[PDB]
Paper text:
During analysis, it quickly became apparent that the sample was compositionally heterogeneous, with some particles lacking the FMN-containing flavoprotein subcomplex (NDUFV1 and NDUFV2, responsible for NADH oxidation) and some particles exhibiting an unexpected density that formed a bridge between the two major arms of the L-shaped enzyme. In contrast, the presence/absence of the flavoprotein appeared not to cause any other changes, so it is likely unstable and simply prone to dissociation during purification, reconstitution, and/or grid freezing. Accordingly, our structural analyses now reveal that Pp-CI exists in two distinct global states but with the unexpected twist that a hitherto-unknown protein is observed influencing their distribution: Being specifically bound to the closed state, it appears to stabilize it by forming a “bridge” between the two enzyme domains. Like many supernumerary subunits, NUQM appears to have a structure-stabilizing role in CI. Unusually, however, it bridges the hydrophilic and membrane arms and appears specific to the closed state. In summary, the results show that Pp-CI exhibits closed and open resting states that resemble the closed and open (active and deactive) resting states of the mammalian complex, respectively, and that NUQM binds to the closed state specifically. When NUQM is bound, the enzyme adopts the canonical closed resting state that has been observed in many structures of CI from both prokaryotes and eukaryotes, whereas when NUQM is absent, the enzyme adopts a more “open” resting state with an increased apparent angle between the hydrophilic and membrane domains.
Residue numbers in the entry:
A (entry chain M): 1 to 491
B (entry chain O): 1 to 192
C (entry chain K): 1 to 80
D (entry chain h): 123 to 182
E (entry chain d): 1 to 75
F (entry chain N): 1 to 347, 365 to 523
């Protein structure tokens, strides 16, 4: 019911917006009536469609059993089996909640073609949401790569000055790396004749073949989180992509890599994952430490936030490769907490400052608290969330991820605690400068945060603190789903 | 596969046309008028010149009717051929085939007919024409010879089936039937 | 001497000289067919040889017409 | 079932110089245009020809 | 079978509707074009369903032989 | 039907007077002939009956269910191509009159269709040589149909010379085999498959590789496709590959009987080089047809990996890939022919000269297509994304099915190289999309009355005048939606490819 309704309804929504806005192309040269107020009616229809998608997952959430082991809502549609568990359910809801936020963040800061942008946003959201409910490797890859087509055009049309560089980077870094993941999927379909999740989870392959399959998949996953040294696409893509593209990229697209570990590595390549964990920890720890020190020297506001996202997703990778429930739950909570804080920091840095001054150079901004006090409150509040200050979901995710690493590997997992210091070094260096000293001589006094931008900031802050104070809303759903990923034989 | 009884692995041209069903003639007419009709439809779909409908000239309709006439016959020829091959339902054609062969056998005449061709040319002609209908859409080739390579055993005509008792055909042995291989090489083994 | 492509020096420096090389190369195939067919006392090889000769003559005419029209295109002003 | 069905269809049985498919239905040389009886080296008896290898139709 | 042919006709409606955008005409221009397009793909859809129904019958017959072939191998 | 109707059309064309309308109506008669040919062929040839393989015409030809599918594909694609010369592509006489000025255009196509369909059926070395000449000669005559064009004639000269060298190589290979065995029929030669020199068949494949533009012989095809008129380049770049690749598959099916791994290595060397040239070759080019020539070289390398592996998974891969690639090839060239109507007109640096044969010659002539026609621009984006291999488009399943067959046979290197080749070629595929759309916002509010389309008049100023003709628009709409929505019927289509057998049986 879920997948069938989520696809059929959105196709009707896509066709409806095309029919209304393209009925007058034929040398009418008219003035229409939907083109008024920057295509307000067409924007409103797409905004409504995004909210309705959140209602569809809710109807299937009411019947979700947290005390059932296995996939639920098992459905067949387009010759593909679709199912949900505790892990998938939360990631689907996170993906769909950000849909309205992506549209509303670009409500009035596009030069034109609002119908195209709204369709692409709703198209990106559904394809990413469907990626959490597929039940085979090939369906995972189809949805993993289908987002590249709209994302490539979204950046190149609505992007910043270096959009051409950013569009090529996202298309080539992600497509080339995922084709290595396709090689591993083809091998599974050749030797086992199926790519079904449950079917492949029960098969033990030779330790040499598991190594080759792990490397193929990890290449696709490592580029998309991203990890060092294949991370160089992300800062360029984030600084040039539109605000809605940055929100979806920083809120959902990066979380597909962690879900890739949960599906494509842990239950099917269990023996070889234990072998690779020290290598994963070394790569991730250096990803965390290097990205934090590199973030210090950055001079672009939207690139600083982009490098901040890489540091925290290294911690998510460390937690998910811990072989205990504490690390796995911590990595998942950190994924959800990051899914709200990171888009909020892009709205503050690339959606409020950029929409007023159209410059992302750090040297132009200081003392903003004198004439933008409301902006400074949200900037300061989200900065402490971004560094894992307690009472925030980020801390609960970070503390359990660090604890899970220590339990997994006491010696090298202890280096993960540098996230506490290093994240505060670069994040509070930027915030201390935007809110420090006299109001900048290079800026003219203008409006403070508007009602729309207050609304976006409030509804990204609220879930972060609710999860931070009472994470059992999330841990109860994840408890039985996460316990299946642990591999150990104690005697 | 819904296979049927094999009647003739290489039916003669005259037999294929004679065994046309009334639908085969109907499709022959449809092909003949389907070609001028498609020229009208293509003009209706999109006029050749400008934006208004114009009937194609009579000379185009003349050559179109000829093209459709040949196309209609080729379709009907392949429709009737499948019944001989057993690919298509051929219950009516089996009853008609059995009557004609038994009638000719009782007259001590070849069911295939006498040929101007020597033994080599009858064999060669069958090699050239057998299964040639599979490429009748590309280029034509027909069995217009009285050869004996038809993929059937004439002994199956010596058992009376349901609905054949009233025919009262007295069939002689195969060595008395004129112009058959089993009754031809009497004095020499390399000359008929 | 063949492996260093000595035949590339024996071909003349006109487009028509390439045509002659093609005819000679194909004629080598037919001589090999006639030689094998005669030794085997096989008429199927000689039928093949006859087919090669007729077909090789067809492409000689088709190629010549292309070269004929190519030369006409250059002499196109034709103010006379 | 889907995994089982693909395993049957995608399996390629081995071919070597001892087993493969040759599409020849009859022995040649029963008749020649002239001089069918040559050096009497044709030792194949077409009156008592053993049954040929009929091809397999998987859909039958 | 109506449900299958209903979708094929709806595919034909989409084909015509997409064509109107290519030619830059209102989607209400010449409404008979949707009826023509819908029937043309119902006809293709009906032939397509016969093709797939035939394929499943042929596949079963071939699979039976393939299973016997595999049983001999697994020994 | 083809042969009979060709003779009537040959005579009829020479009888009536010469006018553009009459040639256009004669082209429509050619459309009816191919349709009747398809209906007659479908009425008599069925996959279930031809599975065994049936000999025709004294065993000179051999049709099976693998050959039959390609014949129907050739007829279907030839139907789509004739719609280009039988209907208006743009609607403006200065561009469309070219397709109606040659009365022998349809005659040559019918000549070549006969050669295309018979070539996969060849069962004798004598008829293999005859048919490969029949197909080649018609291609030369089609390349030179516009004999008043300097580039068209120059291409036909290059085509004739290179294709004659390949034919001699093909003839030389068959003569060597006849010399070894004294036999001409393929099935008779199969009885001695273990004793003839198998590399005598590699020489036969080498001549076939030249005719499909494989590396290192890729240079002439890239040159010819760029110099020929866009209507000619559409046909000659696709049609020879449908038949020759099918014949190569059948030849490689016989070669795999003896399992000569040295022969497998030489072919793998040619595939490896062609991937490198196909991907890196297109990176620095400015012509769209030169870019598509390298795309053709790259997609042929992908199919040849499936042909080289030559297993049960290879039949499904090759059959599906060739069908979906033909439709993508047809769709792209249809759009390129249409979108010449949006070309700006002067009223200058680099002295760029554009001719009537190829109005769209450079990649940057596709600029602002997202503004001029959004539906067509999206249709072109969908096709280009399919060539890239973006799921769930048809091009994704083509690469997926090719990889399955290649990796199942142990071709680890070629599977990795093609996936690297796919990433490299994505750079120049994306450049098309960058030209189409990336400057939309910085150019949306501009006054463009200098287009070719603006030269057309208006009927009444109260009617609605479609900007693109009916037939060409419906074909682009149909093919684009098939490419986009193949996920709906992918399971049923791939089950059909399971039934296409090449002496599998059991
Ligand atoms: C029969 C007469 C005929 O062919 O039509 C008259 C036709 C038109 O003559 P016309 O006086 O110039 O008509 C003025 C218009 O141009 C003619 O315009 P039109 O459109 O009226 O004629 C074009 C004609 C198209 O005519 C053809 O396609 C010729 C078919 C032959 C192949 O279309 C038809 O009318 C089709 C029916 C007539 C041809 C039927 C042929 C059946 C196949 C035999 O004349 C010919 O085409 C003669 C060609 C054959 C010459 C004889 C060849 C000898 C071969 C055997 C030699 C040994 C014996
Ligand atoms: C890319 C290039 C590709 C190549 C394209 C070129 C196309 C070539 C394909 C053309 C055919 C290929 C074969 C050529 C070699 C033919 C040599 C040959 O067969 O000589 C033996 C044959 C005599 O050998 P036979 O074993 O004694 O057979 C006697 C009858 O022919 C057979 O017995 P019957 O029952 O037919 O009795 C004959 C009598 C039967 O008339 C009666 O007494 C009434 C019986 C019922 C008939 C009612 C239905 C008639 C249909 C209307 O009247 C007929 O049925 C005349 C037969 C011809 C019918 C029309 C031919 C269709 C051509 C299209 O010589 C012929 O007379 C053949 C018929 C005339 C030649 C047709 C030329 C077509 C062009
Ligand atoms: C009007 C009547 C509509 C046709 C009714 C029908 O039967 O359509 C078939 C299908 C319904 O589903 P059904 O076959 O009953 O069983 C589920 C398996 N798909 O319904 C469908 O197949 C609809 C499929 C079209 C919508 C999906 C198109 C692709 C969307 C992009 C792919 C997204 C995933 C990647
Ligand atoms: C902002 C900074 C935030 C924090 C940054 C990270 C700081 C933590 C990095 C160090 C990791 C925590 C250290 C914990 C190790 C101490 C555990 C211990 O008890 O030591 C002994 C232990 C084994 O116990 P024992 O019984 O004595 O050995 C004999 C066994 N029959 O094991 C041993 O024998 C000793 C193991 C070697 C310890 C190496 C410590 C150096 C690590 C350097 C890292 C690179 C610099
Ligand atoms: C800037 C953004 C704006 C938002 C900022 C403020 C965010 C809202 C603050 C609250 C956060 C939401 C978390 C509370 C939601 C309710 C959680 C809950 O369900 O409590 C259940 C608890 C035990 O559950 P049970 O025994 O099973 O009985 C209930 C059966 N349904 O049953 C109970 O006993 C309920 C007890 C609830 C106590 C009140 C909780 C409010 C927070 C105060 C405590 C916070 C922790 C103390 C921290 C102080 C600083 C160290
Ligand atoms: C037999 C071959 C000759 C038959 C030709 C008979 C014919 O075509 O009908 C004549 C008719 C001409 O009428 P029309 O030209 O409009 O009036 C004179 C204007 N000055 O022509 C027409 O209007 C076309 C009507 C259909 C013609 C069918 C002819 C088919 C030719 C025979 C095919 C089978 C052999
Ligand atoms: C077409 C007409 C063919 C029918 C015909 O007129 O002649 C057929 C006739 C065969 O009949 P018959 O004389 O009884 O042969 C004795 C068999 N032992 O005798 C013949 O076979 C004569 C050969 C007929 C060839 C007629 C000319 C062919 C047309 C070429 C164009
Ligand atoms: C005209 C289109 C007619 C489609 C007919 C396709 C066809 O040839 O039949 C399916 C064929 C299997 O056929 P078979 O089983 O051997 O014979 C009996 C089947 N009736 O299976 C095949 O092998 C067909 C292989 C080629 C398939 C090509 C698919 C073409 C897609 C549609 C073309 C686009 C239509 C654009 C519309 C423009 C016209 C306005
Ligand atoms: C969930 C599966 C959905 C699949 C269908 C995709 C949408 C089809 C759109 C066709 C109609 C059209 O081209 O219409 C154009 C519309 C709206 O443009 P507009 O602003 O009104 O145009 C301007 C007109 N003015 C000037 C009058 C205002 O653009 C879209 O819709 C864009 C969506 C597709 C972008 C991504 C392409 C990726 C291709 C490969 C995908 C894997
Ligand atoms: C401007 C618009 C932008 C895009 C909007 C998208 C609209 C989508 C409309 C879909 C209509 C629908 O529902 O079609 C559904 C119908 C009926 O399916 P069925 O027979 O029961 O098969 C069961 C389907 N399974 C297997 C999923 C259960 O099948 C069709 O017609 C198929 C669509 C044609 C796709 C092309 C491939 C097939 C041709 C083969 C040639 C090689
Ligand atoms: C048995 C099932 C099929 C039945 C119908 C098929 C033939 C239809 C011909 C009707 C006449 C006609 O096409 O008339 C021409 C019309 C209108 O053209 P327009 O662009 O609006 O020109 C403007 C016309 N004014 C000026 C008069 C307003 O074109 C159409 O409507 C195009 C629809 C074509 C459908 C093609 C279906 C292809 C399916 C392919 C599957 C593989």
């Amino acid at each position: 019911m879920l997948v069938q309704n989520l696809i059929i309804f959105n196709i009707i929504g896509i066709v409806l917006l095309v029919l209304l806005n393209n009925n007058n192309n034929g040398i009418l040269n008219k003035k229409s009536l939907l083109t008024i107020k920057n295509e307000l009616k067409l924007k409103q229809i797409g905004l409504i469609i995004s909210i309705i998608n959140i209602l569809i997952i809710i109807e299937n959430w009411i019947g979700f059993n947290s005390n059932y082991y296995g996939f639920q809502n098992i459905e067949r549609f387009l010759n593909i089996y679709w199912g949900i568990d505790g892990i998938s359910l939360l990631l689907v809801l996170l993906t769909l909640i950000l849909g309205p936020i992506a549209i509303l963040s670009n409500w009035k800061n596009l030069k034109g073609y609002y119908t195209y942008y709204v369709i692409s946003i709703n198209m990106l959201v559904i394809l990413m949401a469907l990626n959490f409910i597929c039940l085979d490797l090939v369906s995972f890859y189809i949805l993993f790569e289908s987002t590249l087509a709209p994302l490539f055009l979204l950046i190149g049309i609505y992007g910043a000055n270096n959009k051409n560089k950013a569009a090529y980077y996202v298309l080539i870094y992600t497509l080339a790396s995922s084709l290595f993941m396709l090689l591993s999927i083809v091998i599974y379909y050749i030797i086992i004749n199926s790519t079904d999740y449950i079917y492949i989870n029960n098969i033990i392959l030779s330790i040499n073949l598991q190594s080759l399959l792990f490397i193929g998949i990890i290449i696709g996953i490592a580029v998309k989180t991203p990890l060092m040294p294949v991370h160089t696409w992300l800062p360029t893509v984030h600084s040039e992509s539109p605000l809605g593209g940055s929100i979806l990229l920083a809120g959902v697209i990066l979380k597909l890599a962690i879900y890739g570990v949960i599906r494509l590595l842990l239950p099917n390549l269990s023996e070889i994952s234990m072998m690779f964990t020290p290598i994963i920890y070394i790569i991730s720890i250096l990803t965390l430490i290097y990205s934090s020190l590199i973030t210090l020297k950055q001079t672009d506001l939207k690139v600083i936030i982009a490098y901040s996202s890489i540091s925290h997703l290294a911690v998510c990778m460390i937690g998910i490769f811990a072989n205990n429930l504490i690390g796995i739950n911590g990595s998942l909570i950190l994924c959800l907490a990051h899914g709200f804080v990171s888009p909020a920091l892009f709205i503050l840095v690339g959606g409020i400052l950029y929409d007023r001054y159209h410059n992302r150079l750090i040297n132009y901004y200081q003392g903003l608290s004198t004439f933008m006090p409301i902006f400074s409150i949200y900037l300061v509040v989200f900065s402490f969330c971004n560094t894992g200050t307690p009472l925030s979901g980020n801390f609960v995710g970070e503390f359990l991820s660090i604890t899970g690493a220590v339990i997994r590997h006491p010696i090298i997992g202890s280096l993960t605690a540098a996230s506490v210091l290093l994240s505060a070094c670069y994040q509070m260096k930027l915030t201390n400068r935007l809110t420090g000293s006299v109001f900048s001589q290079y800026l003219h006094i203008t409006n403070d945060v508007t009602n729309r931008e207050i609304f976006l900031l409030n509804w990204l802050l609220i879930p972060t603190i609710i999860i931070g104070i009472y994470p059992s809303f999330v841990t109860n759903i994840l408890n039985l789903a996460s316990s299946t990923l642990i591999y150990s034989v104690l005697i | 596969m819904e296979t049927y009884e094999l009647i003739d692995s290489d039916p003669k041209f005259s037999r294929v046309v004679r065994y046309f069903r009334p639908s085969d003639y109907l499709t022959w007419a449809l092909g003949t008028i389907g070609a001028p009709g498609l020229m009208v439809l293509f003009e209706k779909i999109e006029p050749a010149k400008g934006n208004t409908f114009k009937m194609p000239p009579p000379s185009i309709m003349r050559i179109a009717t000829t093209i459709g006439f040949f196309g209609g016959f080729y379709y009907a020829y392949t429709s009737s051929t499948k019944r001989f091959w057993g690919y298509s339902e051929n219950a009516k054609e089996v009853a008609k085939d059995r009557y004609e062969v038994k009638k000719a056998l009782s007259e001590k005449k070849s069911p295939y007919g006498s040929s101007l061709l020597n033994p080599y040319q009858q064999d060669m002609s069958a090699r050239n024409s057998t299964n040639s209908q599979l490429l009748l859409a590309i280029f034509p080739w027909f069995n217009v010879a009285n050869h004996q390579s038809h993929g059937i055993d004439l002994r199956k005509y010596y058992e009376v089936r349901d609905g054949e008792e009233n025919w009262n055909f007295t069939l002689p042995p195969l060595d008395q039937v004129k112009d058959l291989d089993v009754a031809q090489y009497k004095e020499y083994s390399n000359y008929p | 001497m063949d492996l260093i492509l000595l035949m590339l020096v024996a071909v003349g420096l006109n487009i028509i000289d390439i045509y002659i090389m093609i005819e000679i190369l194909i004629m080598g195939c037919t001589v090999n067919t006639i030689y094998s067919a005669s030794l085997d006392n096989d008429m199927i090889g000689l039928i093949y040889s006859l087919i090669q000769i007729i077909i090789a003559g067809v492409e000689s005419a088709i190629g010549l017409s292309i070269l004929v029209n190519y030369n006409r295109i250059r002499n196109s002003e034709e103010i006379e | 079932s889907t995994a089982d069905l693909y395993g049957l269809i995608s399996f390629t049985p081995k071919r070597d110089i001892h087993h493969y498919v040759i599409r020849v239905d009859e022995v040649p040389g029963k008749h020649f245009p002239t001089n069918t009886t040559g050096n009497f080296g044709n030792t194949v008896d077409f009156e008592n020809l053993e049954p040929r290898r009929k091809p397999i139709n998987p859909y039958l | 079978m109506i449900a299958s042919l209903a979708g094929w006709g709806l595919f034909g409606v989409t084909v015509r509707a997409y064509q109107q955008g290519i030619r830059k005409v209102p989607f209400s221009y010449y409404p008979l074009g949707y009826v023509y397009s819908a029937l043309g793909w119902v006809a293709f859809g009906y032939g397509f369903n016969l093709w797939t129904e035939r394929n499943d019958k042929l596949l079963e017959k071939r699979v039976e032989k393939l299973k016997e072939s595999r049983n001999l191998r697994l020994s | 039907m083809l042969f009979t109707s060709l003779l009537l059309i040959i005579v009829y064309g020479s009888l009536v007077n010469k006018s553009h309308l009459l040639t256009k109506l004669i082209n429509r008669l050619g459309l009816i002939i191919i349709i009747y040919t398809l209906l007659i062929h479908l009425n008599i040839n069925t996959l279930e009956n031809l599975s065994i393989g049936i000999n025709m015409f004294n065993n000179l030809l051999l049709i099976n269910s693998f050959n039959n599918t390609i014949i129907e594909l050739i007829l279907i694609i030839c139907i789509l191509y004739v719609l280009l010369i039988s209907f208006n592509i743009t609607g403006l006489s200065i561009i469309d009159n070219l397709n109606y000025s040659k009365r022998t255009f349809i005659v040559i196509v019918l000549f070549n269709i006969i050669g295309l369909t018979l070539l996969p059926l060849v069962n004798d070395i004598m008829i293999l040589f005859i048919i490969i000449e029949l197909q080649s000669y018609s291609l030369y005559l089609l390349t030179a149909i516009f004999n008043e064009s300097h580039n068209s004639t120059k291409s036909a000269l290059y085509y004739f010379i290179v294709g004659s060298i390949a034919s001699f190589i093909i003839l030389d290979a068959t003569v060597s085999i006849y010399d070894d065995l004294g036999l001409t029929n393929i099935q008779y030669i199969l009885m001695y498959i273990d004793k003839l020199e198998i590399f005598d068949l590699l020489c036969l494949l080498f001549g076939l590789f030249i005719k499909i533009g494989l590396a290192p012989f890729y240079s002439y095809s890239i040159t010819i496709y760029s110099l020929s008129p866009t209507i000619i380049t559409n046909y000659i770049s696709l049609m020879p590959k449908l038949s020759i690749l099918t014949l190569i598959y059948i030849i490689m099916h016989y070669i795999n009987i003896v399992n000569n791994t040295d022969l497998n290595y030489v072919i793998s060397f040619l595939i490896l080089i062609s991937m490198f040239i196909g991907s890196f070759g297109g990176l620095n080019v400015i012509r769209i047809k030169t870019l598509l020539a390298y795309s053709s070289l790259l997609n042929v390398s992908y199919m040849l990996l499936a042909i080289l592996s030559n297993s049960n998974e290879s039949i499904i891969a090759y059959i599906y890939y060739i069908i979906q690639y033909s439709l993508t090839h047809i769709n792209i060239f249809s759009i390129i022919l249409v979108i010449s109507i949006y070309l700006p007109i002067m009223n200058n640096m680099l002295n760029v000269m554009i001719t009537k044969y190829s109005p769209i010659e450079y990649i940057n002539q596709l600029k602002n297509l997202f503004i001029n026609n959004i539906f067509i621009a999206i249709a072109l984006c969908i096709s280009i994304f399919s060539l890239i291999g973006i799921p769930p488009l048809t091009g994704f399943y083509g690469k997926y099915l090719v990889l399955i067959s290649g990796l199942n046979n142990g071709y680890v290197l070629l599977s990795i190289v093609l996936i690297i080749a796919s990433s490299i070629s994505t750079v120049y595929y994306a450049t098309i999309l960058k030209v189409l759309s990336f400057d939309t916002l910085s150019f949306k509010d501009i006054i463009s009355n200098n287009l070719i389309i603006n030269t057309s008049p208006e009927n009444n100023n109260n009617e609605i005048k479609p900007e693109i003709s009916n037939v060409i628009s419906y074909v682009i709409s149909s093919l684009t939606l098939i490419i986009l929505l193949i996920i709906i019927q992918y399971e049923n289509i791939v089950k059909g490819a399971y039934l296409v057998l090449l002496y599998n049986w059991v």
